[PDB]
Each structure stands twice: as structure tokens, then as C-alpha cells.
Amino acid sequence: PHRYRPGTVALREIRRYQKSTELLIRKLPFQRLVREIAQDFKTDLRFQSSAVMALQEACEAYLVGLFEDTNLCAIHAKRVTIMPKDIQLARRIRGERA
Amino acid sequence: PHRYRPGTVALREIRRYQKSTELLIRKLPFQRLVREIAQDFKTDLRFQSSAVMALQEACEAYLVGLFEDTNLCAIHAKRVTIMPKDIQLARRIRGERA
Amino acid sequence: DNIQGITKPAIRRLARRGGVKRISGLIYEETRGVLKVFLENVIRDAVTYTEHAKRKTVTAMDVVYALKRQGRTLYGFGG
Amino acid sequence: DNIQGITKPAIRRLARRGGVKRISGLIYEETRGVLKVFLENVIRDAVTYTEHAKRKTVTAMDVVYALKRQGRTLYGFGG
Amino acid sequence: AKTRSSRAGLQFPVGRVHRLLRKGNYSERVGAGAPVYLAAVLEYLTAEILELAGNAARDNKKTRIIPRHLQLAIRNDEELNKLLGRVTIAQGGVLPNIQAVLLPK
Amino acid sequence: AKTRSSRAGLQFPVGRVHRLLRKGNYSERVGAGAPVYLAAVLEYLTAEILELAGNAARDNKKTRIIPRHLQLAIRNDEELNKLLGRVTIAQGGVLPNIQAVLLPK
Amino acid sequence: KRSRKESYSIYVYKVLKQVHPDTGISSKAMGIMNSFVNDIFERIAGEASRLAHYNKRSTITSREIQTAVRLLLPGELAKHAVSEGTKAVTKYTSAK
Amino acid sequence: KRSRKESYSIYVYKVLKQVHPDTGISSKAMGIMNSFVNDIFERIAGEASRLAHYNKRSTITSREIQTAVRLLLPGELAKHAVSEGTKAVTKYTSAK
DNA sequence: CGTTTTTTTTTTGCATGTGCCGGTCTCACACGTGCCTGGAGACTAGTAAGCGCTTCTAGTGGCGGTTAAAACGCGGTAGACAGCGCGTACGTGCGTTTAAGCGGTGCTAGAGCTGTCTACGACCAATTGAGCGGCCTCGGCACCGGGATGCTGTTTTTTTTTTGGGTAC
DNA sequence: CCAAAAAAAAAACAGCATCCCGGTGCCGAGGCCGCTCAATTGGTCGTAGACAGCTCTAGCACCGCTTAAACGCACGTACGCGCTGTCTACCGCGTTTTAACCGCCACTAGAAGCGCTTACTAGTCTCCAGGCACGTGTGAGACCGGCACATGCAAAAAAAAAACGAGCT
Ligand SMILES: [Ca+2]
Ligand SMILES: [Ca+2]
Ligand SMILES: [Ca+2]
Ligand SMILES: [Ca+2]
Ligand SMILES: [Ca+2]
Ligand SMILES: [Ca+2]
Ligand SMILES: [K+]
Ligand SMILES: [K+]
């Protein structure tokens, strides 16, 4: 009755995705978020297919890099688990928030 | 004989220097250091006094800002002392350092 | 609320690419908040570039130009 | 020891403005290294400006142009 | 002859601004609205700082604005702080701020 | 048999660059050497990345360089990674890199 | 005599007196206010400069200065700044 | 239709065959390489432009392009680049 | 020195992923082709800038007294940090549910291109007042001493928590 | 429960720093002046871009399968974190030493301004091939078997390192 210990699969997932370059958000739910966010500014707005791709490439790139930094913050607190305050410190030092 | 608890003066010193705007590095030493570091790029260089003051206003600003971001890293690790690893994390997340 | 379309499993995968091994339960709602702002701050400028060119279609170049202003230059969409 | 001309008490003052209350003894030398790598990166560019202008005197504007480049724009010395 | 700035209702030199736009290698040609609009915006932003900067100086019991007043003005206004978030104001110091965890109990 | 590229010994179009320089609102006048010097630097940096990208490709048993090869080339090199420290390369992923403390004993 | 060093300082003083008639300004504080006008000048001008080149157009119009200001200035600053510009131009177009 | 959109991708292929004659390039990779040359074109051209303007000169010369490269490229990259660019200028002012 | 326990450490035992061969099928890199527009050319003309020559700004160096700042050492508290111990918040792994992803069709907004035509801005010369450098003055503000006030720390006393007996299952 | 020992709480008390006031004196903000060059005016000419009309690209909607991925629940391990406890690094303040600071004078490097002169680049009209779009081919690479193979965990193998005689000096 097999059971990998907590954090064994995680290290595999880290290894797996760090190897690859595929977008890790499902494209339709993302596109919908773009158009929703867009609506606020200007209504009846069309998007090039590439434009929504450029925006997901970006959004993901950004979030991976924040988790990088957010992780170092968790390690600095002698933890291994990233928590909201980890993100908040990453972004306050980055200059993205006051 | 009267004696202040460790850090009561520190708090006072913080309040004092956050209230004031004077350059906190002694001018002559700093100017020597500016000339020293210049000789690495070109020999027999002259400097406008403003050019030296510009550099000191810049360094002092940078360092105060760095100590602010450092101090946050220290508190994040449930400490009150800034240590080299608070400065290293700060500069890493800023992207000054690999 | 298409933000909820940004699923826990998807956030975890981004986190994993970001070398993360363990993850608070509060991070998924946090991460969504940060994402929304990022897309707001980029799109707002993208759509401004759309409006000025007098179009009804946000082009990739609009996004490229916006991302460059947010200090997030993007290669391979018309850079 | 020009770099030491940046005294422990000077650095300690800078940190107090930074609102630091307590300071490891290792900080003072660490701080000297950060400051050296800061002036090096500015004075480098600063001087590159002086050179290109064919001058033997570094001008405040040279510094100002250098800081703007390093992403550290400074107000009240020209530009 | 009366200045473009007089016509446009501004304190800022529409003339000067027009010249700087031609001489600044920004575009081949410069429209007639452009320098008027740009002058207005620089005047508006200049007003907003000096407004708050004045209030800063009055709260010190000082007649003349000094760099610190400008700094107190800018760093305490959320939007002006964001506009000048990558800008160092010589002789301005920093806002009084001590992390709660550092105060005694 | 002549062309401004082949006189300077380049694959980058010294002509194209000289026109981009004139038309791109940088200065009134463009010196004849400027577009030569520039084409050279753009070529030299393109070579530097291709060299290392094709060393990451040939290291995957791949005939064709893809985005990931370019990224790998640029991030593992300290100097290139600096020059492009604020750029995102799309379909580029991130260097395999796990923090030691997260590993098992 | 010394060569001519131009400056925005006579107009800063004008605006200051409009907003605080009984308030002065140090030489340094004036130098900061100058750095400021030139900074934002360059920022708007350059962002306009780009907008024009992006839309294959030879001319920086008021419309470029506007879009540039909506890109650069945060929230309420951009709205108010945009109005002031739009007023200034209208009034300038009426007097000719 | 389809405009007539100019690229760098031939001059990239003509350098890829010179360094690594066996191995080629996908579109997305050639796109990232086109972005790259355009980015750095602008960074250098832009700094040269300022370099000129600061010094009250009307012409961007190979000298402006040089100083600009000293400011923009890190340690070794900045030396090698200067050379290749000094090399290319000399061989061109030879070849008439 | 041996002789019981424990505390560490070594080697199987399966169960899960990647890592790797062989085919092998598609679509996108590659190259060829023909045609258009952007680079090339030789010309004239003007002026941008290199150079040489003059001005006098302000950057450099030196000196000697004052005193604030750095230094260095003594002492002790309060913080870093290591260990322990407890409660559940996360990770894993199923079985169930969802809707993204795929390939395809059908409709048309609007992206994008062309040609035409003129309102607008560049360029020009003359005109002149705004804004500059230089110069003068006089009150704001820096500096100082003196007294009021607020905040700290110590020692004493009070208040509650907290902790080591004295009987019960 | 009983009772005693701390650990916090409140209290009074000396003390040191900080803050506020009026007084003094210096200099830099402020404003005035006279000259200068940059903005204004009014004129002509060219073309950038506004607009109308036409092409057709690709963005949108919709549909209907096949999974791959999301979701939800069960269960338990390993982590986050609160508590305690120990060692000294870092803070405070004192006495001793240093050199920054200031004001000043003397010297001249070189910043900066002006005038001349010509080599270099912009502008123009003519030519044409390099580089474009478009379109077809063909082999790289992604896909899909199964087959070593490495791992990595559930332990039992044994094998070291402690807890306790040991029994003698
Ligand atoms: Ca094969
Ligand atoms: Ca249309
Ligand atoms: Ca006058
Ligand atoms: Ca051909
Ligand atoms: Ca082939
Ligand atoms: Ca397979
Ligand atoms: K000088
Ligand atoms: K006065």
C-alpha cells in the first residue's frame, strides 16, 4: 500500500516544470480574465490571438519570478512553506507596493 | 550613575536622523574615496564640488533605502538585528545581485 | 468572476516552476490578487495604445509596448 | 584605508535614518563593500561621460547623467 | 504682440516649450496644441507639489519651501510618490517611520 | 561588386541601420561610421547568443535552436543575463535550480 | 559676463504665488523644482515621441501629449493634468 | 496585402550558419532574436542620441555609438563589442 | 575491562517515475522564384565641428588652530539561537466530476490599404520685450542660552501568577 | 486544597533629554536694472494625414466529441510556532586621540567662449537588386509502444555507540 512522504512528489513537480516551457494556466479561463479586465476600461474590445498569448507569457513569467523571490523570503524565516507575508515582503522590496 | 537600557538611545538616534536631512558621512573622507575609485577609470581627474556632493547625496540616499529594506528582512526573520544576510536578501530581491 | 478560473492546481504549477516545495492555503487568494493588478496595470496601458491608434482590436504590439513601459520587456511578439 | 574613512559611526548613522535599531558587527564591512560597488558603477559611467566630452574635470551633470542611467535619478544638481 | 502663454491662460512658457520639443529630436514636426497642453500639464503638476510643499513649510513654522518640505509633500501623497518613486530629492531626508516591533512595550 | 555591409565585412545591413538611425528621431545628422559601428555590435552580440544557443541545441540532439535554448544560453552566462536582466523570453521557462534546504538528507 | 543658463524658476515662483502668496522658496528647493519640470518634460515628450513613431506619424500633436500623460501620470493626477491641458488648448484656439 | 514587414531574420541566418553551420532556428526563436536586435538597436541609438544632445552636437558618430556601448554593455561584452565595431569602421574606411 | 540495551546505520523489497530504444506521421522550416521598393550613386550647397587661440573660472594644495567626532575599552543586559514539544495545516492518493482542448464550419467587424486633396507646420526675415546676468538689501532663519516639559529608569511595594506540599485511587 | 516564591503592576522619584521661547547677526532670497537674443509676427510653399472607399484578414460564435485536468474527501506526517533556557554580542558611556572643519591665500589647469575654415552629411533625382510576399517540399521532431533503471521508501541485518556492572586500585 504505497505512500510517498509529504514533499517527495513536490520536488518531482519542481524538477518536471523547471525542465519544460509550456504555459501552466489553462488558456480559455485566462483569455476570459483578459476580456473581463479589459471591459472595465473600454467595452466591445477585440484582441489579436497573439496579444492574449503575449499577456499570458508575461503574467506567468512574472508570477514564477515572484515565487522565486517569495521562496527566498520563506527560507530567510527558517521556513520551507511560502505564506502571504513572504509575497508581501518580496513585493515591498521589489518596489511594486509601498 | 544613570545608564540607558540597550536600544533606548538607538530609538532616540533613529528619531533624530529621520527628522534631519544633513549628509551623515564626513565630507573629506568621502571625497578621498570618490577620487580613489575614479583613478581606476582615468588618472589626473578633477571634480566639480557639486559632482562630489551629487555622488554623496546619491550614495547616502541609496544606503538609507537599502538599510530600510535590510531592516524589513531582519524583522521578517523575527529578529531586530540587521546582519549581512538581511543585506544580501534585500539586494537579491532588488535585482542588484545574482 | 473568471479570476477563479486561475485554479489552485495552476498556481501550484507556477509556484513549482518557481522552485517552491510547500505552500500556505492563503497563497491561492493572495496570488490571484497580485495577478489581477498585474493584468490591470498592463492591459490599461495596452488598451490606451489601442485607443490612440483608433482601433477596436488590442494588437500584440499594444501589449508589447505596454509591458516595456511596466519594465517587463517581452521578446518574440514583435519586439 | 580611504574606504575605512567610511567610519563605523557614519554607517551606524545612515542605518538609524534607515530606522535600524540594532546592528551586527559584520554589517560595517559588508556596508563598505556595497558602497564601493555603488560609487564604482556610477563613477565608471560618470567618467565615461567626462571622457566622451573630452574633459579632464568631472562635472555634476556627468554624475546626474550617470545616476539617471543606473535608475537612481537625482534632483537639485542640474538636468 | 502678446505671448502664446497669455492667450492659453498659463504661467508656463508655451514658446519655450515649443522650441524644446523641436530641438529635442522627439518628432519631425510639432503641432500647435502640443506645447500648450505640455505647458499646462507641467504647470498643473508644479502647482500640486508647491501646494502640498507650502502646507509642509507652514507646518514647520517656515516662510520659504526647502527640499525637505518638497520631500514631505511628495512621499506623503500616494500618487506624487509613485510618479517620483525612482527619484532622489537632494537634502530631503526620509519620512519619520519606526517599525512597531522596534518600540518598547 | 560592392555594398556598404561587405566593405565593413558584415552580415548586418549597414545601409538599413543608417536609414533606421536617420528616421528614428535620434539626431539631426548621422555620421557615416555610426551605422557601421552599430551593425558590428548588433552582429557581434547576435553571434555570441547563437554560438551558445546552438551549443544548448546540439546538447539536446536538436538541429534547430528553440526559445528554451536561447534562454538557457542567456541565463547561464553572467554578462548576457545582466544585459537582458529585465527581458522575458517567451516559451523560455527557468533554469533548473532547487534551493539546497528543500532537498532530502 | 557669464553665458546664459536658462531655467523654469520665474514660472515656478509665479505658480507658487498663485497657490501660496506669502510663501518663499530656497535656491536648492528651486533646483529640485527645475529637475522636476525637465524630468517630466522628457518623460511626456519621449512617450509622445514613441506614440508617434509607433503609429507611423511625423507629428507630436496635443493628442500625443494627452495619451503620453494618461500612460505616465498615476490615476487622479492624469485626469486633472489631462483636463488642464484640454482647457489650455481650447482657450488658446478661441483667442487664436 | 500582408504589409511588407521588414525583419533581421536573414542577417541572423547569415550569422547562425557562420558560428554553427550544422544547426538552424525555429520561428519563435527567430522572433526572440528579432526582438533582441531591435531592443539593443534602440538602447544604443537612444544613448548615442542623449550623448550627442548633452554635448550640444548635431551628429551621431561612431564615437557616440562607442561611448553608448561602454555605458550599455557589461565588462567583457563592452570590450569585444568596441573592437568588432572599431574593426568594422577601419575595414570600411579602407574599402573606399 | 566487559556486558545490557539503544541508537545508528546497512542492506533488501517492492512500487513509481523518468530515460531510453525502436517506428512513423505531420506541419513548418527551408529554399526557390519573381517582382517591388529602399539602398545606392554622383551631384551641389551649407554648415557642424575640429582646431587654434584667448579668457578667467574654480578646482587644487597647503597651513594651523579648534573642537567635535572617532577611537578604544569596560561592563552587563537583552537578543540570537538552539532545543524541545504540541496541534493541525498541508501533501498524497485515490474516485468523481468538469470543461478545456480540438477540429470544423459560418459570418462579418474592422484592420488595413489606396488615392485625393488641403489645412497645417516648417522655414524665413524683421521686430522687440521677456527673461537673463549682475547688483544691491534687509528680514528669515540659523545659532545660542535659558527654562518648562516630557519621558526614562530605578527602587520600593503591591497583586497575581505560579509552583512545590499533603492528602486521595 | 495548602502555602510559598516568583513574576508582573503600580508607585514614587530623580534625572536627562527634548522642546519652546526671545535675542542676535549674517547672508541669500528677492527684486530691481539694463542689455540681449529668443519668441513673435506675418509671409510663402509643401506635404503629412484626414477622409472616403474598397479589400479581405482574422477575430468571433457555435457545435460535438474525447480525454486530461479539476475537484473533493480520507488520512497522517512533518512542518510551523510557541516556550524555555543559555551565552555573549552588541549597546551605552567613559576617557583618550584624531583629523575634519574652517577660513584663508596662492597658483594655474582647463572649462569655455569666439573666430575661421573646410570636410563631411543632407538633399535630390535616377536606377535596380536585395529583400520582400507568396507558395510548395520534405525531414525534423513529437508521438507512442515496450524495456532497462533509477529511485525511493516499507523495513529487518547487524553493528556501532551509550547505560550499567566491574571490581580494583
Ligand atoms: Ca530517432
Ligand atoms: Ca477603417
Ligand atoms: Ca522688463
Ligand atoms: Ca536574388
Ligand atoms: Ca529540409
Ligand atoms: Ca512512449
Ligand atoms: K575651471
Ligand atoms: K527681504
Numbering used by the authors:
A (entry chain A), B (entry chain E): 38 to 135
C (entry chain B), D (entry chain F): 24 to 102
E (entry chain C), F (entry chain G): 14 to 118
G (entry chain D), H (entry chain H): 30 to 125
Paper text:
The eukaryotic genome is packaged into chromatin by an approximately equal mass of histone proteins, which provide a foundation for modulating gene expression, maintaining genomic stability and regulating DNA transactions in general. Histone octamers composed of H2A, H2B, H3 and H4 core histones assemble variable expanses of ∼160–240 DNA base pairs (bp) into nucleosomes, the repeating units of chromatin. By introducing DNA annealing as a site-specific and directional driving force, cohesive-ended nucleosomes can promote self-assembly into well-ordered lattices with a variety of possible configurations.
This 169an (n = non-equivalent termini) fragment is engineered with a 3′ GTAC overhang at one end and a 3′ AGCT overhang at the other. Importantly, this demonstrates that the pairing of the termini can be DNA sequence-specific, allowing for control of the directionality of the inter-nucleosomal base pairing interactions.
